[model samples]
Target chain A: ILQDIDRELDLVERESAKLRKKQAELDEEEKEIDAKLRYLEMGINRRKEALLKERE
Target chain B: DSKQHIEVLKESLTAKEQRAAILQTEVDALRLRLEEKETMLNKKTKQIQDMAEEKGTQAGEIHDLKDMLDVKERKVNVLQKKIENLQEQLRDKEKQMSSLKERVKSLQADTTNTDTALTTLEEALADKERTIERL
Candidate 1:
């Protein structure tokens, strides 16, 4: 039973590492998407302002 | 001897339990972050869609404005030509009157008829001026 526990612990460690790596990759992707969203929002606001000015 | 083995087993079990607990904690942390990431991704996706929609609306409005400007510019050109044509007509009528005046002064015949014709020409000139002013 103890040996089985040891094997289980190793498996958990390996899986945890994989998951942590995945989390890091997800974080990186999130950052990239955040930047893109901010850029797009700024562009939209600029066009909105221009539209408003055209009305005036 | 069995007691020693039991103690060793208990120690190993306790250690494994601690390890598992730590792994669980790490897993929970990663799960939370993953959930947050998915939520943020959804939010950003929605934002992109909204931005695209707004951009489409703005582009359509600008296209419409450009078309209106084209039509208005053509109207302005047409009205300008009308004004120019009226002014040219006025100038020709003024020249005709001046030459007739010179001829009448030199001839000095039929005073009453000349006066009546002069008044008619003046009235025609006033009407043309008023029409140009109205335009």
Candidate 2:
């Protein structure tokens, strides 16, 4: 059953490829979300600082 | 022959088994990433709650979104809504233009009727003039 094992290994490698590709997608999506959150936080922080100065 | 071939098969099977284990490791690596993706998704809601910053409250919906995020939230909300609605209006305009083009096409098709109506008026008026002459 050498061929059988070969087939099994082939399946696993192919499965590995899909997972790797999918990992990249999730990484990019997660990165984008982080960026959005960071930018929004920066804007609010800036606004807060501006108002703080104004009230002073 | 039997012993040699059996040894070869065993060797080949072990090679495949080792490779499978390595590939399984790769799959596990990807699984961890997928798991973290879910964590990040969860963080989205957790993040808003943290930003909202209120007591005995669950989320940003409860005026829990503090000054740190509130004004910007509304600003972005209104602004984004404006953009989305404006996009919808542009979509409607395109649909309207497409309808108008069809109407124009139908008008072109009916243009022959214009001559028919004109001829009727022309002959009617001409008949009146002939009657006038008889009088």
Candidate 3:
């Protein structure tokens, strides 16, 4: 059990570092989704604008 | 600041999800509006076609109807131009929507795998923390 114990501490130090990196990736994913939503909203606004133009 | 990173990361995920639901509704509504424009163009086209047949039957206003057809043709072209723009815009929306959907699936899958490893790692770390304290 003691052999198991020290080994895990070494493993967990690396695991903790990896989790932090993963969390940063998750934040990036969130920001990307945010940018996409902004793009979608702009898509509608532009329609309202250009559709009104070249009026008969 | 591991704790702080975890805290803000959770906040970011929460904030991201809130707008996604709102935006989907707007995107679907825009799709309906695009369909509405398509219907208008189709209906007007058929109306012009029916008018086209009438001139053949009436046979008298040949000169007057020729110019009339030009005006109607102009209108059809306008409708078609508008339709083209709307069609492409709708297509663009779908393109963006598809990418957003793909990103979301990836984000969700990543969270599940990441959290699972994180939970096991935390438990192991906690076990070590207690053992070291006892010594």
lDDT values for all models? 0.70, 0.65, 0.64
Q: Tens digits of per-residue lDDT for model 2 on B1-135? A: 999999999999999999999999999999999999999999998988866653322342233236436545655654565555456555645655554555455435577899999999999999999999997
- Model 2 CA lDDT for position B115: 91
- Model 2 residue B135 distance off true place after TM-score fit, in angstroms: 99
Q: Could you give the TM-score of chain B for each candidate, in order? A: 0.67, 0.35, 0.39
Residue pairs clashing in model 2 are: B52-B64, B52-B65
Query: TM-score of chain A for each candidate?
Result: 0.74, 0.90, 0.63
Candidate 2 deviant stretches above 4 angstroms: B1-135
Please tell me which model should have the higher TM-score, number 1 or number 3: 1
Query: Rank by TM-score, descending?
Result: 1, 2, 3
Compose the digit string of candidate 2's lDDT tens values, residues A6-55.
45555655655554565556456556545666665676566567657876
For model 1, the stretches where C-alpha displacement exceeds 4 angstroms are A1-56, B102-135
Pick the winner on lDDT between candidates 1 and 3.
Answer: 1
Q: Which candidate is the best by TM-score?
A: 1
lDDT string for model 3 (B1-135, tens) is 999999999999999888998899999999999999999999999999978865653453444456455545655555565555455555645555554555455434567889999999999999999999998
Docking class of 2: incorrect
| Deviation in Å, model 1, residue A28 alpha carbon | 64
Q: What is the lDDT of residue B11 in candidate 2?
A: 100
lDDT of 3 at B132: 98
Please give the distance, in angstroms, between residue B102's alpha carbon in candidate 2 and its true position after superposition: 71
